[PDB]
């Protein structure tokens, strides 16, 4: 008991989330959000080198997202660790 | 072909990043960002259950961040997978 019919969000649902998903896709997986906020965010973009010394054309892209409190809240890039949950 | 002196960003620097870091802490680790953008973002908050039959007081918190493209760009929560990089 103790939790009503549909509000139970599980770790399995969180594990299905992937970067790039739209709000509609998240709503299907997670259900309706409990609280929604809008604010001014900042994104920081970097070129980075894997196996340093590889040259300018071998660089890849990473983006960092900061939230309302100006604290790091997201990492966009191509790492392929077998993404289960993004992070936190 | 060879990148210039002091803007070489490595995988090791990305691995040091953690959620909650400020822009000043990131700037120390990563150097000055290549491109900076500001936009309107959305955050979606959820309570979730760690295991089935948890009860209301055993729920934890997860926050989802959506970027300018209305795509999932970050996750906030408590997972403790030994965060190397916020997945992407």
Those residues whose C-beta lies under 8 Å from the C-beta of residue B2, and which sit 6 or more positions away, are: A55, A56
Method: X-ray
Please state, as a whole number, how many other Cβ atoms lie within 10 Å of the Cβ of residue B19: 19
Chain centroid offset of residue A78 CA: 12
Q: At B46, is the secondary structure helix, strand, or coil? A: strand
Distance from CA of A60 to the nearest CA of B (A): 10
How is chain A classified by DSSP, letter by letter? --S-TT---BHHHHHT--TT-BHHHHHHHH-S-SEEEEEEEEEEEEEEBSSTT--GGG-EEEEEEE-TTSBEEEEES---S--SS---
Distance from CA of B70 to the nearest CA of A (A): 6
Q: In this structure, are strands B60-66 and A35-48 parallel, antiparallel, or unpaired? A: unpaired
Tell which of A32, A35, A51, A65 to mutate to test the B interface (max B CBs under 10 Å): A65
Cβ–Cβ gap A18/B88 under 8 Å: no
CA–CA dist B3, A59 (Å, integer): 10
């Amino acid at each position: 008991i103790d939790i009503q019919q549909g509000n139970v969000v599980t770790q399995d649902m969180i594990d299905q989330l992937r970067p790039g998903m739209t709000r509609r896709q998240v709503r299907f997986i997670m259900g309706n959000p409990l609280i929604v906020d809008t604010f001014h965010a900042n994104r920081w973009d970097y070129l980075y080198s894997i196996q340093p010394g590889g040259g300018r054309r071998q660089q890849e892209r990473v983006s960092l997202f900061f939230n309302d409190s100006d604290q790091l809240a997201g990492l966009n890039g191509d790492f392929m660790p077998g993404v289960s949950r993004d992070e936190a």
